[PDB]
Amino acid sequence: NKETDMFFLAISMVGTDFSMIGQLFPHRARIEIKNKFKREEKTNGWRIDKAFQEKRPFDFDFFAHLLQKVLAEEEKRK
């Protein structure tokens, strides 16, 4: 679930640029991003549209940092 929220927040932040997406996550390839989109669209087209509208300020260090923190939190709690 949290990883799903991460793709949604990323694509809000940057749009549907699967290459940059796959680069920023540590072990997700562009093909994985495409497969995830193809799975999720049917139930989350509304969320994709909201994200396209949600042109959130894409800061490099801010997002890298919040990523690292929440990955660490998820790994510890999972």
Partner: peptide
Amino acid sequence: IALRARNAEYNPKRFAAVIMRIR
């Protein structure tokens, strides 16, 4: 185009073209 478009993807290191997506 890659800079100004939300749905654009660009990656010259792999290929010199811009991809596009619409729902």
